[PDB]
Write a protein that binds this ligand. Structure first.
Ligand SMILES: [Ca+2]
Ligand SMILES: [Ca+2]
Lengths: 98, 98
């Protein structure tokens, strides 16, 4: 929906880059990249989605960057934050794109 | 924070009006008028706040208008929606207002 935001976390450059890649109706499943981590804010929760081929640093820091988004976006303190793996059942995550 | 939205449900005009009255950092506790119903979207959950002096119709329809807000705002279908009374104790609602 309109409040959604999708961000990419990548250290493929040699340093971490945490960049917004889409928001609102532009948040599409086909923007996810198995090589990186993605942070998805749905309007009700924040997901740290860990691609199968994400790096050791991306995987270790996935949750801390999702937390950084929660704080800088001004989301309320009970916002659920969940770390999920690519390919998992991830029913709540998958329902966002349903 | 910035994503917060506050809407007023009132039939004081002679018919039901449901309209946004504040958003972002302007969503403040002194906007909770005991005479009406207010729907608060925090960025993660929705509350139907029921003023003690709201009308019979405002109190009956409060929750339905909060649920309809989830639909019309494009929020996840499982977004928490809770009906709460003026002066009541709700941890998440109170925490949003510090
Ligand atoms: Ca990577
Ligand atoms: Ca009233």
């Amino acid at each position: 929906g309109p409040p959604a935001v999708l961000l990419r976390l990548s250290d493929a450059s040699g340093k971490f880059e945490f960049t917004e890649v889409a928001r609102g109706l532009k948040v599409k499943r086909n923007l996810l990249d198995s090589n990186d981590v993605f942070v998805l804010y749905t309007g009700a929760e924040v997901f740290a989605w860990v691609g199968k081929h994400a790096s050791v640093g991306e995987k270790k820091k996935a949750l801390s960057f999702a937390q950084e988004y929660v704080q800088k976006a001004g989301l309320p303190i009970h916002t659920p934050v969940a770390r999920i793996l690519e390919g998992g059942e991830n029913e709540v995550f998958e329902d966002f794109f349903d």
